[PDB]
Amino acid sequence: NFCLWNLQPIQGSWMGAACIYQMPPSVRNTWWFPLLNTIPLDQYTRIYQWFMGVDRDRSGTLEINELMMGQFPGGIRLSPQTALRMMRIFDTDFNGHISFYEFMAMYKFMELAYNLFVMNDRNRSGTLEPHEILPALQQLGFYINQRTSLLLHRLFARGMAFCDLNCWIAICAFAAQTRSAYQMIFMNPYYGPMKPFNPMEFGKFLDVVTSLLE
Amino acid sequence: CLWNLQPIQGSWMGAACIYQMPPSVRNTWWFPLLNTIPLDQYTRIYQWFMGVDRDRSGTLEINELMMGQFPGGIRLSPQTALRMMRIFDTDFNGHISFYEFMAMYKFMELAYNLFVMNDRNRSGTLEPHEILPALQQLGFYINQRTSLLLHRLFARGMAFCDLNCWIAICAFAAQTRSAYQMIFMNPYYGPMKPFNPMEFGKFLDVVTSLLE
Ligand SMILES: [Mg+2]
Ligand code: NA
Ligand code: NA
């Protein structure tokens, strides 16, 4: 339902079966590509309409200041800091621009992360306490240990006691950004033939890397 | 450079002393720093270490580390002291061994000497654009964007990089080298590749971006 690594394509997706292979391999081959096939036709049309409207120079890309104008699921408004992390899930060579398919995926990633926060606010307090962060990330497919969980709150909560939607979205941006970093590292053919993605093993990477931000 | 340190005559250990070092010391990336410490420097570090190790545990904790008088007047903030500990302490023990300290100290002196070498106008500061070549000389093959971020991350708003900023930078780079070992010694990735500075630099660039 929420696992980033095995999102089922939906009925009534905006793409027909052959369209998948019309996508450039650049998009096709990415870890986040399955997000695209969970977007229904009407959400696609809406996202497309928006992007064309902000894309005043007709470049086919957004940069961070256009991204921050976005009207995101749950009324999420992006901080500069979080918008940068979000761009960097997709912009892995610091162009400072994302494509339309990358934006589509970012938007659907935000919706999934929103929905997940709401699902986990079982007591309807409107926030997550820091000890609630770990099982929620686990549902998304990020397997971390308790120390990494509590450091994530520290790092991204801007001093607040609990984890509001803004802090959750920053944590999820960082976690996905880190997933793209892992790809970029291990894409390097110096490491030899690439091992398949394993969430348990990735989690150890996320633990070690999160420590470095302290 | 950091990965290819020349042995010095008058090292504090003789040739047989090297094979009696503990395996958890011998098989680290930083081991070769130890054989660059002259005899008189050893007895100095030894004497100091024994002095601050108040309960005679044979270990050093962060508060005692921060009492150190380091090369060139370096003073470690709590945050830089933590990074320094983490080069060595990679499983959150909260302390380091005598030998781990010796290595940290010599690492500091190496960074200091390199700072001096690159401070061409003896201003006691490096300009942002001067950071990259000095890091390359140390063995950290990073790109310009990475160098400028490291400055901005660690400079406390200053436009320049003083020695204390330089050591914070160096601590982070070294900390990341230990992290690299941590990640890659996981049997899932297979036998670790021989260390390569050019490939490690790419890692350091990617990881540094995550801090922004
Ligand atoms: Mg003690
Ligand atoms: Na709650
Ligand atoms: Na200077």
- Supply the DSSP string of B81-148, one letter for each residue: HHHHHHHH--S--S-EEHHHHHHHHHHHHHHHHHHHHH-TT--SEE-GGGHHHHHHHHT----HHHHH
The Cα–Cα gap between A133 and A154 comes to 12
Any A CB within 8 A of B5 CB: no
Which residue from B176, B193, B212 is facing A212, i.e. has the nearest CB? B176
**Nearest-CA distance B42 → chain A (Å):** 31
For β-strands B59-60 and B96-97, DSSP reports them as antiparallel
The answer to the question of whether B89 is labelled as a binding residue is yes
Instruction: Answer for the pair B174, A184: CB distance below 8 angstroms, yes or no.
Output: no
Long-range contacts at A18-27 (CB < 8 A, ≥ 24 apart):
A23/A101, A27/A99, A27/A101, A27/A102
The DSSP secondary structure of A85-151, one letter per residue, reads: HHHHHH-TT--SEEEHHHHHHHHHHHHHHHHHHHHH-TT--SSB-GGGHHHHHHHHT----HHHHHH
What type of residue is A142? F
Q: Max alpha carbon distance in chain B (Å)?
A: 49
How many Cα atoms are found within 13 Å in the side-chain-facing hemisphere of B156?
A: 9
Instruction: Answer for the pair B53, B64: CB distance below 8 angstroms, yes or no.
Output: yes
The interface residues of chain A toward chain B in range 139-168, judged by CB-CB distance below 8 A, are 147
Three-state DSSP at A160 gives coil
Experimental method: X-ray
List CB contacts (< 8 A) between B172 and chain A: 212
The vertex-B86 CA angle with B81 and B90, nearest 5°, equals: 160
The Cα–Cα gap between B190 and B180 comes to 14
CB atoms closer than 10 angstroms to residue B15: 9
Three-state DSSP at B166 gives helix
CB atoms closer than 10 angstroms to residue B2: 21
The Cα–Cα gap between A4 and A15 comes to 19
C-beta atoms of B86 and A208 within 8 A: no
Q: Which residues contact B117 (CB under 8 A, 6 or more apart)?
A: B134, B137
**Nearest-CA distance A181 → chain B (Å):** 6
C-beta atoms of B207 and A211 within 8 A: no
Q: What six digits make up the tokens of A123?
A: 């007591």
The Cα–Cα gap between B181 and B70 comes to 27
The Cα–Cα gap between B169 and B159 comes to 15
Residue of B139, B127, B141, B155 lying closest to B206 (CA atoms): B141
The Cα–Cα gap between B61 and B82 comes to 10
**Nearest-CA distance A119 → chain B (Å):** 28
Q: Which residue has the tokens 């023990």?
A: B93
What type of residue is B27? N
Find the helix or strand (DSSP H, E) in which A63 lies: strand A61-63
Instruction: Answer for the pair A207, A148: CB distance below 8 angstroms, yes or no.
Output: yes
Question: Per residue in B133-171, is it b (16+ CB within 10 Å) or e — as a string?
Answer: ebbeebbbbbeeebbebbbeebbeeeeebbbbbbbbbbb
List CB contacts (< 8 A) between A205 and chain B: 183
Span between the terminal Cα atoms of chain A, in Å: 32
Q: What are phi and psi of A58, to 5 degrees?
A: 55, 40
Residue of B141, B66, B64, B49 lying closest to B102 (CA atoms): B49
List CB contacts (< 8 A) between B186 and chain A: 201, 204
Q: What six digits make up the tokens of A157?
A: 């909560």
C-beta atoms of A94 and B145 within 8 A: yes
Q: What six digits make up the tokens of B163?
A: 């020695």
The vertex-B179 CA angle with B5 and A193, nearest 5°, equals: 95
What type of residue is A97? H
> Structural domains in chain A?
1-214 (1.10.238.10)
Q: What are phi and psi of A163, to 5 degrees?
A: -115, 100
Q: Could you tell me the resolution of this structure in angstroms? A: 1.9
Q: Which residues contact A185 (CB under 8 A, 6 or more apart)?
A: A191, B202, B203, B206
Instruction: Answer for the pair B59, B89: CB distance below 8 angstroms, yes or no.
Output: no
Instruction: Answer for the pair A168, A128: CB distance below 8 angstroms, yes or no.
Output: yes
Three-state DSSP at B60 gives strand
Span between the terminal Cα atoms of chain B, in Å: 28
The vertex-B114 CA angle with B113 and B117, nearest 5°, equals: 90
Q: What six digits make up the tokens of B79?
A: 């945050």
What type of residue is A201? E
Residue of B180, B83, B197, B195 lying closest to B136 (CA atoms): B197
Q: What six digits make up the tokens of B96?
A: 């380091």
